[PDB]
Subunit: 510 residues, 4 copies
């Protein structure tokens, strides 16, 4: 699908390009090769020039007597030259510098040639703006350049995003464009950075850009602290009510239980109803959370490992209700399961409280990454050695697998047991096997712990929990801007862009 | 409240300032704006010039035909130009360099114009000298510059603080001004650095400046070692006497106890009186310590966590006396409480003894920061799981909460208990709950310990206990200087400033 | 054995060398001194010049009217000038640079003078090419230079190994010579790097050179994943069959056991036959592995510590069979030993699964390096203290060594025992000895663990498991190349060298 | 005591010094001031000039028409100019460079003016050569310069210490002067570095200088390996004999024991005699070791902590003999004590065996530095809490201190005990006290371990055991040189200086 102009752009023989354009060959068309091993640039000469160190060629292409190159052209994916430039970024110092410079130059040139049109709002077929993709794909450099972009040339000042409302000696106040940042209402940058599954390279590094962290802190201190505390208090109240109702369970038999006229019975019924309603609410919240987020199965356990616990607790409560209305005695078992699991899940609110711990990330390094491994290996060892031992046994209580495993389990943990290291032949063989099993398992545990410590030392000497907490609570006085005035457009109309006031104290470069 | 001269100082159009002053507009007045978002400089043109890179403007302002600018002017807060310069410091290399240079230049110029006056002793309304505020607010750079300041120009040599009594080849001896350092008797710098609540940025970094550490070591080796050892010995004697008196408590009944003529009874009465007197003394010492220090409630536990223990021990002893003189049998309980707590508090003297341990700071990282967290979480888990278990129980001894919690406590710690994992339905449910509880609690403990180790490795690869011990013991042969002679004043009078002899061995720059 | 030309080469008096050669003295001969304290260079003037900063002298020697120096001469060891240059490399930046430059220059010059001959294929008496020795002896720099060598001069382009099939803007594809790399079929470089005993300096650092890692990954993802999973599955199946057969062992007496017509008996016989066949297969695989590798006795335990376990398991199974066919009752003991050991050896497949753990190298730092040390020291302590204690004992059950050691063992581990700290004189002496023993042993354990952690922190902050797994499984759709065309030889014949396509995305130096 | 010439040397007015010397004032005399706050230079103008950046003045002083300055003058301490220069060194890069240059210049000048005299052998009143003091006082730079000193000027080449017997291309062999290094027979440098108490700054850093480490390794591989192994074997034999003799102790009563004619009795008597002789030998070796070393009391435990153990073991054996020949039954107790302690002391030979452990220095960081601290604190806690508890007790078995402490000891370690948490009032008080005691003690232990790990990580990331082992075994085929020839003296006599051949492979600077 390649055409001569594409090769000339690649060869950069600007004489040949000028000769091809002098006849007026073409300036758009498109490449559609399977290769286009491969390399993607937007299947256009405009994008090809913009992406491969061509300022002269792109300047010549965008406007010319024979056939001006439309800058608003949308490709099969809708990849505009700006969106293609975003797609090509690779997060390198030289590459980042060059791509930011190219973005600036192309934007200013397009504005100067066509001031009425605004290329920033252009979106692809998927329905994403170039900044939205820069955030989704993890392009830190392009995002950093855009979020604090500024233009110092008349007739295109409107394209800038950061300004300086007033400067005073050392202190000077700067304004930031929050449009498409806090509430884009469609694919807000914060939302995309937060939602996006955990494989993007620099999800954490992209929430430290200047406006974002301050915006999150402002939202927090505005309302989210109160929302979080209210949720914590109401959850504690619900758990206390559930515990009180479950403690006073009647022992007559085979529910349902008939209401007896008394204050205690009325209170018990009220508490039962409230607990069931709360469990039902949790079930619905979890199911619709899953519906609207649609996370990857791989991310269910690595991420969002608390919502699953809440959902299964709700499942336990619902199963308890079902068994309660079926004349069964296992409703109590299900109820106690749910109660204990809720008391455990109360830990979710440990966050939002600095005092409770700053480095609570080892929970994820350990409750799965090492606990599950150790349990698996230990169970395999248990089964194998128990089978060997029971095979060695002649008769008695321990010629069965379960009895032998239950006691080989006891020896290991120091509970010990009644010494059945006796009453059979091959005494030395049995003692040797027992020693081997106990040693090996404790060796394995010792390794898990050594690995934990060795990882934590540099995980803590090499390097956002609230960045997610704030958004989730927000999505359980929510503007974060005031519609300032930053001049006018190419036309003479007041421009309003939800500026976020920020003031920094500086004491040099006066 | 801003006036044209203020703007001109900000704009730095020294032509415009010269024109404004040529008419003789004004050179003092004051700014009083709510803003004066904000920025503080001393609400004067003199301070404004001194604080914002103006040497020419300040030189022109301080003296001029039309209206010389009084350098001794005191503002609403009493902020002199020097005190304002101290207030503006932000602890940056360039900012520190500039502010120190400005301080030097302004001091020398003011001395030259008005040699009789001494601006250093000037104090604000609060009653603090500029050095005192530099120490209180945590301005390390300004303090470091001032403490070892020196002037190499005749007619202003008196303003210097560091000198060179005699230089000998490699070795040369320098003298340091200790006025307002060791015993200012009002707001001594050491005292301010020590008292100041724990939020100042660099309280530790400000006790390493050259004179201070040597001064503290000299005071220590002079007297404080002996004072500390004497206190330790007398406390041990008192504790031994108290233990001996408490051991021989009579068992007759319902004090007070009538004196029986015998040597043992006389000794017992003497010991009881001495112990009560000591407890009373501790109570008074603690109460008046609290009165004269008035620490923040937030700093009671983080800092001064031993004085609180001593005070509560004294409270226990006093309550014991009160119950003793009321015909009650709980005086023994209170007495044993106080005795045990004093034996524990004996640890306070572990400091002052290098040999006992250099890195004993983990006490603070752990006895509160992790012990309290773990206890809280473990108690919550205990309550929830015990309620669940007792709800599951049908009848018997363990259908009560306390009996179940007392045994669920025993399983966890390896004491175990008589196996009540029996004699009821839902056996598997109970065993599952028990396993969950035990596991979870030990998982939590394992995390606390991992966090401890991971924090300690770099707390000990990244970075004063005696700096506080020495001052406190001093405040339970206390001069640290000898009134040397360092020349004369602008007048012809001998100058005495409590020089502290210091000699350093150097082998370069000859 | 040294001759004047050798000294002149050492002295570098190129005038004297030219005068010696003008008469036509000689250009080959050989040195044979015991010294040739010592220094090896290939016992030739050609090699001596090439190895000691002589380009002019080597250029003059290789060709001259009087006596051209044959470059293909082979010495007593067969050390060609190229092979000698490889032997002299010492892995230093300057030395590496110089030796690579000398190799390049000598190769190109030899090709230009004698294009028909190919010096690369030349091999020593041992039967190794220069690259093979560079890999065997651990010469990283020479290997790195050779593996990605390239020549930019006509008439010798064939000597190059790396090419550029097509370059496209940023992306450009390069081809690598895999001849003598993947399957040399004689002494392949990968094979030599892997086999070579563990004393070579940089066995790990030599498997990161550009082509090698990508080649290993390609082989893995091609077939080795499937081979490994198939082996794991079949081993699990065999172990399950063995366990099932061993569980149902009859209890009649004194094998062999007569076949009773029933489905269960048929299945039991089938399982027994399969298990014996598997053990026999493992025995043969291990013995022939040892035969064909012939590792050092020192490397048996440090390396290949799993094959030994498999072999001894097979030995246990064979001994079980032998005792089974001899009317003995210890076949069961041998069978259970083999069963347990196989269940343990199942851990070998933990590798090949990232998820199970990345840092599983501490196994080697600990299962031997610390476990064996601790066991040895603890057993010595046990023997000494038990002898002392039994000597102290007067009469009773514990006047024998075994009874005392069995109980001194119990005290230490917290099992405790029936308190025999009673019923004899010198009570305090016994208690003191017991305390000493217990303390000392736990002190020793505490040290082993401290050393483990202190080593692991920097072993994990300072710095291939699959590099060996892949080769071993390969040697349990195996080409890794496609016979590309890279031009022609000095003659006009198509050249085929098993190119490995590789494409790298680069965004600079255009 | 200062004289005008001293001041002029200090002022460096070489015109004034020339004028003072023109009259011929004096060139020796001496300073004797109490100051000579202070600064020591050798109380001479020659030493003063040499020590304070004076080459011109020292050159003028050493020789002049009026009064040549004797360079061999010895002061009150005998401080020659060279010895004074050694004394003044402070181990700084600039100071080290300058002092080495001054030493070189003064030595060469003194040799040229007076070639017959040799200033190196000059010794102070204490009887030490300048190199000996450089080693004793910890002057690393001066020692490093001297040990590999070289002079490239005829008529003074003899003063050099390092030479080059033969250079061959890359490899070149250098010879080192071992006189006064290996066996000075008086105050050998190695001996001084080893003996010297543990306060010298860089005892370790001074055993890495080029000749010393190679010399130690050569001595080791020559004989010390065999000596060490022989000692280990003979000690093991003696311990086995002692254990066998002690096992068969007769039980008749009240030694001495009459000899009964039998092989067993003869063997028993032989073993007893051998054991007593060995203990006696150890006692004598230890006492005379202490006599000839005379270490500081502070260094007895920090250093040489194994010789003390051996000596006390010998004391136990001797006391056993004494009680044996006095008709007492405690000879057995003493014998078992000595036997157990010897079995423990066997650990001393763990060194000399790399395999047993490289980082076995934590023994010293822990067996004293933390074990003793923890034991002390724990015993204090034990006493205090036990006194409190026994005071609380009313009657029964535990109204005595020992019974209560013995059980409060048991609770802590998990042995537990028969639950006496019962049968008295103030139940809650007792339980609270018990919890407090147990917690506090385990908290303290946890801290000791945390400190251990935190210290070991950087003690092992920041930085000789055999350096001491080798010397001690040597001092339980001992030349290490061969009397090479290195030219002649200023006279025409062959010079012999025990050269140590050393050859280094170098591949640059040809
Ligand atoms: Na136990």
């Amino acid at each position: 699908g390649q055409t001569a102009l594409h090769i000339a752009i690649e060869r950069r023989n600007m004489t040949l390009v000028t000769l091809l354009v002098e006849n007026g060959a073409d300036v758009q068309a498109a490449a559609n090769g399977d290769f286009f091993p491969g390399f993607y640039f937007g299947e256009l000469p405009l994008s090809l020039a913009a992406c491969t160190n061509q300022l002269a060629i792109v300047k010549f292409l965008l406007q010319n007597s024979w056939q001006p190159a439309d800058i608003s052209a949308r490709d099969s994916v809708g990849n505009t030259v700006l969106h293609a430039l975003v797609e090509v970024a690779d997060n390198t110092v030289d590459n980042t510098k060059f791509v930011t410079s190219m973005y600036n130059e192309i934007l200013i040139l397009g504005a100067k040639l066509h001031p009425t049109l605004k290329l920033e709002e252009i979106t692809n077929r998927k329905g994403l703006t170039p900044l939205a993709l820069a955030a989704s794909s993890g392009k830190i450099g392009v995002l950093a350049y855009i979020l604090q972009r500024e233009i110092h040339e008349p007739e295109c000042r409107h394209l800038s995003r950061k300004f300086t409302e007033w400067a005073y000696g050392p202190v000077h106040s700067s304004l930031y464009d929050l449009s498409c940042i806090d509430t884009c209402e469609k694919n807000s940058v914060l939302e995309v950075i937060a939602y996006s599954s955990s494989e993007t390279p620099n999800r954490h590094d992209m929430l430290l850009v200047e406006p974002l962290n301050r915006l999150l802190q402002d939202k927090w201190d505005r309302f989210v602290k109160r929302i979080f505390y209210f949720n914590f208090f109401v959850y504690c109240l619900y758990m206390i009510i559930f515990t009180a109702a479950a403690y006073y369970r009647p022992v007559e038999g085979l529910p349902p239980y008939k209401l007896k006229n008394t204050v205690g019975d009325y209170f018990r019924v009220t508490g039962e109803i409230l607990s069931v309603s709360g469990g039902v609410y949790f079930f619905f919240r979890g199911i619709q959370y899953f519906l609207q987020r649609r996370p990857s199965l791989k991310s269910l356990f690595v991420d969002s490992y608390s919502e699953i616990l809440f959902f299964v607790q709700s499942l336990f409560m619902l199963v308890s209700v079902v068994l309660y209305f079926s004349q069964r005695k296992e409703y109590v078992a299900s109820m106690v399961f749910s109660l204990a699991m809720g008391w455990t899940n109360m830990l979710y609110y440990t966050r939002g409280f600095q005092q409770m711990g700053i480095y609570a990330v080892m929970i994820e390094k350990m409750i799965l990454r090492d606990l599950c491994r150790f349990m698996f290996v230990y169970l395999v060892f248990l089964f194998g050695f128990s089978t060997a031992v029971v095979t060695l046994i002649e008769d008695g209580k321990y010629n069965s697998l379960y009895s032998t495993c239950l006691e080989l389990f006891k020896f290991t943990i120091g509970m010990g047991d009644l010494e059945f290291t006796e009453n059979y032949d091959f005494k030395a063989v049995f003692i040797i096997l027992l020693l081997a099993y106990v040693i090996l398992t404790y060796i394995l545990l010792l390794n898990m712990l050594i690995a934990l410590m060795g990882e934590t030392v540099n995980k803590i000497a090499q390097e956002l929990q609230r960045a997610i907490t704030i958004l989730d609570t927000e999505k359980s006085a929510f503007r974060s801007g005031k519609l300032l005035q930053v001049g006018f457009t190419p036309d003479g109309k007041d421009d309003y862009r939800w500026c976020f006031r920020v003031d920094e104290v500086n004491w040099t470069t006066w």
